[PDB]
Symmetry: D2
Subunit: 248 residues, 4 copies
Amino acid sequence: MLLEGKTALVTGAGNGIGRTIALTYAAEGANVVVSDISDEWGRETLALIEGKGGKAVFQHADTAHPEDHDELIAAAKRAFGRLDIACNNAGISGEFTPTAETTDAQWQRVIGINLSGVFYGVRAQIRAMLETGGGAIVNISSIAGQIGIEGITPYTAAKHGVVGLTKTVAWEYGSKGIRINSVGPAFINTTLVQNVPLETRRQLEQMHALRRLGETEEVANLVAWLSSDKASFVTGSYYAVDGGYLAR
Amino acid sequence: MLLEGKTALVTGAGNGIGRTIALTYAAEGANVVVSDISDEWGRETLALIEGKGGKAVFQHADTAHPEDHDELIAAAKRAFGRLDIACNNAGISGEFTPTAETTDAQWQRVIGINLSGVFYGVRAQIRAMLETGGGAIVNISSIAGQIGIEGITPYTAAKHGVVGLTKTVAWEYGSKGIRINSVGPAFINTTLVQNVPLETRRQLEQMHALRRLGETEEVANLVAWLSSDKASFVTGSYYAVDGGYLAR
Amino acid sequence: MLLEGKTALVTGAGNGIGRTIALTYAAEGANVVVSDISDEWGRETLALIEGKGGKAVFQHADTAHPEDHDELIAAAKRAFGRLDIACNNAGISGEFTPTAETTDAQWQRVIGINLSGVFYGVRAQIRAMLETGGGAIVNISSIAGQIGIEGITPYTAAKHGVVGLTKTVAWEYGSKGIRINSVGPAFINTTLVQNVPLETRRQLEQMHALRRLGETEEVANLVAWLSSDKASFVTGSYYAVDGGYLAR
Amino acid sequence: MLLEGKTALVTGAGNGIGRTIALTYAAEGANVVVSDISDEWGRETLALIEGKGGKAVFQHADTAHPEDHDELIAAAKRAFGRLDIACNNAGISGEFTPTAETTDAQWQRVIGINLSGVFYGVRAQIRAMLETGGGAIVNISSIAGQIGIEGITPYTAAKHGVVGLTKTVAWEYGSKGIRINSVGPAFINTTLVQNVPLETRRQLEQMHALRRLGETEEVANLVAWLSSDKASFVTGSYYAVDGGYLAR
Ligand SMILES: NC(=O)c1ccc[n+]([C@@H]2O[C@H](COP(=O)([O-])OP(=O)(O)OC[C@H]3O[C@@H](n4cnc5c(N)ncnc54)[C@H](O)[C@@H]3O)[C@@H](O)[C@H]2O)c1
Ligand SMILES: NC(=O)c1ccc[n+]([C@@H]2O[C@H](COP(=O)([O-])OP(=O)(O)OC[C@H]3O[C@@H](n4cnc5c(N)ncnc54)[C@H](O)[C@@H]3O)[C@@H](O)[C@H]2O)c1
Ligand SMILES: NC(=O)c1ccc[n+]([C@@H]2O[C@H](COP(=O)([O-])OP(=O)(O)OC[C@H]3O[C@@H](n4cnc5c(N)ncnc54)[C@H](O)[C@@H]3O)[C@@H](O)[C@H]2O)c1
Ligand SMILES: NC(=O)c1ccc[n+]([C@@H]2O[C@H](COP(=O)([O-])OP(=O)(O)OC[C@H]3O[C@@H](n4cnc5c(N)ncnc54)[C@H](O)[C@@H]3O)[C@@H](O)[C@H]2O)c1
Ligand SMILES: [Mg+2]
Ligand SMILES: [Mg+2]
Ligand SMILES: [Mg+2]
Ligand SMILES: [Mg+2]
Ligand SMILES: [Mg+2]
Ligand SMILES: [Mg+2]
Ligand SMILES: [Mg+2]
Ligand SMILES: [Mg+2]
């Protein structure tokens, strides 16, 4: 067990990669604070953990709303006493729209969740971790934190922004035993790709050196490692889980 | 002259690097649309250009307000009939504040100007440039688009985000005649930086391979070059003007 | 155990980070082919592994000599029948010498070990891994694969080169079952670093966000993870273990 | 004129990008020291410059041979008194060969020219520039200094290595007024691409945001700028001339 006895929160844990991160955290021995904007989905992630013998609670949170983060931290402390680990996973792609046609609402929504929501979490999580001598934060960026994806300017800007705040937080709090890193997945087998035509899927696959898409477990395994004491000299860094996407 | 006959707008052109960019554009033969949130400083820049016999106008714009971009584009068209070049320079540092103490207002203000305001300008600028066959955009990022600077998480996130939206836009519009790049200055002798105490200056200098701070002309020269047809195979890229800051 | 039943070779395994990698591989269940240019140090590593009941052999290899790689591969096959994992760790710093004073012999020696020797190993390792369906390679680069360190131009060039050949190999062999990644440590407490004067240690520490140097286990843990099937979507990439060094 | 009165040497100036760099340097007012391994080609570059009214000399040099660099520097001083600018352009692609099948000779030849030859030049050029208070060096890397190109592991390793030694030299000599930068072209219209089928050319073109290949002048224009006093705060940096290749 990588994470025995540690307390870990996951944002956007109701579905997709976040669900798998929460399950992996629990399987590694962590006490998990499941959160999502969807209580139905988040509740089911909680029930999944509990039915597998893990220790967890659920707390609602819209990561775009600063006040929700306070409630996360309070839930963590109430259930488990401290916060050791946090994964800022909640995020959306946005619609595919060329920049010149991207509306203010499109821009604002994606930045608000994917960038501001990460900042508001990280801010609250630092404060909680300082109470008890540090901790580990993992932000879910993307390949789009290092390269551009056409049609999703807001997403690319946000995901680059996540990479940047990781760097600054690492220096501000490394003295105090907070580690923070980003993870950059390439295309992962989640709902969006599941619903494109095979031909499109094959074109995405050929953009990876492994010539296939990733699975959510492949992302979660790296998040778990980075959240663990094995990763004790790793901070301020971007860790790809990209199947070689960025290498060409 | 690098830019003879071209029409260029500059945001944040009332002082600092933007003023020098505007001056440089005019000295290279461009018609200049000077804009700033401070109409006094913007009018000053205009006066400096006109005093040398350059062709320019001033138009107010707060880059954080989408509607002001439409008035910028309209001012360019009214004055000079087209838009060929745009430099998204307006930006603020924020106050130095550790992430855990950074307020919502601090985060939102810096993102709104330094990231959203760049997006809103780029969006307007693309649309205008496409009317007449394309053009060149230069976004002013920072070293903080590549590394972190303690105390300015908002700034770092924003400046990374600027790097990212440069990449997408370049691919979306590269076959349509629009080039876009980002410039990353290190510490530059604007009024504020000029006036730091000597012991602070020396501390900053030692962070640069050249063991000195930069001058606004040193930034503006690169911006001018990137805005010119000499730079016809240059797009989607980040150009440091950093005195070696990033190289260690 | 991360690596149960796998056969792993380590270059430069007689001391320092390589010794710890070898130990870690064995503790994670791998059969280990320990190799080094120093047969005494290599035999010591072997003894440490065997003393705990691990399965291992020693084979001499100077990584700069192509033919020694063939004997490594042959030793793996003879002992354990296949090769699943390889870590190209052997490396030297060179002496600190400004570029203008660096001799041909200094340049050639460091490139020969740290760059050519990595290539010669990777080449042999690919061929062997392909016999049995693929495998995982980890190259030890450095922070000096991403930034420069004054006085060690040869080292910096070599370590950048290691980063680059990781990328090509990942694409060439990613559909054939071979993953390859590079690891970038900052300053680590090997024997030499352990023994620097306190005022030098403190100067180095301040270059890391964690305000301390790393331990060999902190490197080895990442190498083990990257060598395992948990890392199945990770290829072509650079993984810092740098305590935040690169983030400023 | 960007370079009036400065003395500039170019390696590999007999053909391709290097020829165009030498011509551009001369057109910008520099005194040019043309060098190549091919005296026939280099002599013709000299005659081209002279027939256009420029000032230049030719000196043979195989960049792989350290002693040849001494002869370059001596030629520069003999003709023109000092060395202000140097462009380390000479380079080869190598054959396209998967890593596992790349021979020692292939590896050694490409590293010897593209990496060691750059080091030997830079070493000699620093020494000469220090005599007269500094100067500017431009190394020609590639997109393959930042990403991998299948089939050319040696080339990718070398071109990454060039990026690295740029960083270290910038810090070692920035105090002393030596600037050094790398340039990274994507696919440029030179002999190789001229001889592939259209279909292949179109596939390469689609890898660039501009959806076309670069021209040698587009590279030379950036080299000229970086070699000039306009670029006085630019050091230690990688400058793409990639048509957006790296942005995806
Ligand atoms: N799927 C991919 O290929 C991929 C690749 C790279 C990065 N990512 C990133 O991975 C993370 C997880 O996304 P996913 O792909 O698993 O998506 P998903 O759509 O399957 O799941 C997203 C989860 O986040 C929740 N959510 C959405 N908005 C929220 C908000 N405002 N507050 C709280 N929860 C919210 C959803 O309800 C859902 O449970 C995101 O940051 C995404 O950008 C995904
Ligand atoms: N000075 C440095 O060391 C440095 C280093 C790296 C990057 N930069 C960047 O350079 C750019 C210019 O900064 P500077 O240092 O010259 O600053 P400055 O403070 O000297 O000038 C900024 C100008 O922008 C204007 N401005 C501020 N907010 C604006 C808004 N909302 N809309 C329009 N105009 C606005 C100001 O009124 C002023 O004229 C910024 O993007 C900054 O982040 C500066
Ligand atoms: N120690 C650090 O701070 C640090 C930081 C970043 C990267 N690295 C890298 O870590 C790797 C290991 O270095 P270390 O610090 O543990 O060094 P070390 O000097 O402690 O151990 C190096 C080992 O490699 C062996 N070796 C040397 N030349 C060899 C050759 N030609 N062939 C085979 N074996 C050879 C030595 O005999 C020794 O056992 C190197 O690639 C180094 O560049 C080290
Ligand atoms: N052509 C491209 O698409 C491209 C793209 C990226 C980078 N590059 C780089 O641009 C530089 C110039 O190459 P090019 O494409 O113009 O090639 P080219 O083959 O047209 O010209 C190369 C020149 O270098 C000379 N040369 C070769 N080996 C030499 C040696 N050992 N010493 C001295 N001179 C030598 C040749 O005789 C020739 O004049 C090289 O570093 C290359 O790697 C080229
Ligand atoms: Mg359901
Ligand atoms: Mg408390
Ligand atoms: Mg990193
Ligand atoms: Mg740095
Ligand atoms: Mg001919
Ligand atoms: Mg002299
Ligand atoms: Mg750079
Ligand atoms: Mg790419």
